Design a protein around this nucleic acid. Structure first.
Length: 246
DNA sequence: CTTATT
DNA sequence: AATAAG
């Protein structure tokens, strides 16, 4: 099965990803920025117990680490509890980058009628596959208490304004060669949502095998549960792709 | 929780 | 002078 043939490619069997070819990211600040330390609003025990096992898993995975930082932003006290960091004051102090992710409408314009066999993959915990340079880690620090200090991220965090664009650009670099090796396949990338299109069932099977092999080797992980493999009809970016339509 | 947006 | 999102 698709599961068995590519253990490394799937999130369910390959472990947490890590994009091994990508240098740890340095996050430039605006020219006038200085650190902001925002106090953590008190969190109820209910919310703290809800959040706690997620924090512990991330610590175990090395995605969070202890730190002491002059930066601090709050975790939401009401966040099915999973921690959500309010990074708006950090985002304001980080230098802007050009938004290079295409909007879905334009992206799908590059899908020709000749290619009507589809594979759709979504990468699991995509931002977390990208390492942050140690110099940039303190930027994203927050407080954590167990009724005691700060933690921060060692990977590109949720809620950071440039994460989608930086991920999209990193994956484009990592999939550049795949595109060159498979000139007859169509590959659409929208941050962590991928569409592979081919002219035949067999070509789509072979391409999908090569894409999974490649993604796994690079350190990314796709959702086996959500995967739509070699169908003439798929759901991609809120559209139903069918009979060359939409 | 905070904060931007008829 | 509810709303959606970090």
């Amino acid at each position: 099965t698709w599961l068995s043939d590519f253990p490394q490619a799937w999130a369910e069997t390959g472990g947490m990803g890590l994009a091994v070819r990508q240098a740890p990211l340095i996050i430039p600040l605006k020219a006038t920025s200085t650190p902001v330390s925002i106090k953590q609003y008190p969190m109820s025990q209910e919310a703290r117990l809800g959040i706690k096992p997620h924090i512990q898993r991330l610590l175990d995975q090395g995605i969070l680490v202890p730190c002491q930082s002059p930066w601090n932003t709050p975790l939401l006290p009401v966040k099915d509890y999973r921690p959500v960091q309010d990074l708006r004051e950090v985002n304001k102090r980080v230098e802007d980058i050009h938004p290079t992710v295409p909007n879905p409408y334009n992206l799908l314009s590059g899908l020709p009628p000749s290619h009507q066999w589809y594979t759709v993959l979504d990468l699991k915990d995509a931002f977390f596959c990208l390492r942050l340079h140690p110099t940039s880690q303190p930027l994203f620090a927050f407080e954590w208490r167990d009724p005691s200090g700060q933690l921060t991220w060692t990977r590109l965090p949720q809620g950071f304004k440039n994460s989608p664009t930086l991920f999209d650009e990193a994956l484009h670099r990592d999939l550049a060669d795949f595109r060159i090796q498979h000139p007859d396949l169509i590959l659409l990338q929208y941050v962590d949502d991928l569409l592979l299109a081919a002219t035949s069932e067999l070509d789509c099977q072979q391409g999908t095998r090569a894409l999974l092999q490649t993604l796994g080797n690079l350190g990314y992980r796709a959702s086996a549960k959500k995967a739509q493999i070699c169908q003439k009809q798929v759901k991609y970016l809120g559209y139903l792709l069918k009979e060359g339509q939409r």
